[PDB]
């Protein structure tokens, strides 16, 4: 399946993901296209932050769903 990740600027990127993929894998998929380290990025779905441990199937992410991407660089 494919899902859509929506940045804060309003830009939308599409990702070829399988339900068995972990959130960790998703942030790596984002890293492939955007070039940002998976630890400086965080994903939001259903008003909650997604943890790298669980998979999409655990979070009920389905085909053509929308995730929100927020970036925060380490301030020390």
């Amino acid at each position: 399946m494919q899902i859509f990740v929506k940045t804060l600027t309003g830009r939308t990127i599409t990702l070829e993901v399988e339900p068995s993929d972990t959130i960790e894998n998703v942030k790596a998929k984002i890293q492939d296209k955007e070039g940002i380290p998976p630890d400086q990025q965080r994903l939001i779905f259903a008003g909650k932050q997604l943890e790298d441990g669980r998979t999409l199937s655990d979070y009920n992410i389905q085909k053509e769903s929308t995730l929100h991407l927020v970036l925060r660089l380490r301030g020390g």
């Binding site: 804060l8 259903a46 008003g47 929100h68």
Partner: peptide, 28 residues
């Protein structure tokens, strides 16, 4: 009665004047 931010979906606590996630401001 958690409020959701305008710029990201994240629902925050009523006491928070700013979202914890994208550091946006409280909506009018």
């Amino acid at each position: 009665i958690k409020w959701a931010c305008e710029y990201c979906t994240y629902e925050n606590w009523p006491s928070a004047i700013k979202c914890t996630m994208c550091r946006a401001q409280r909506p009018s």
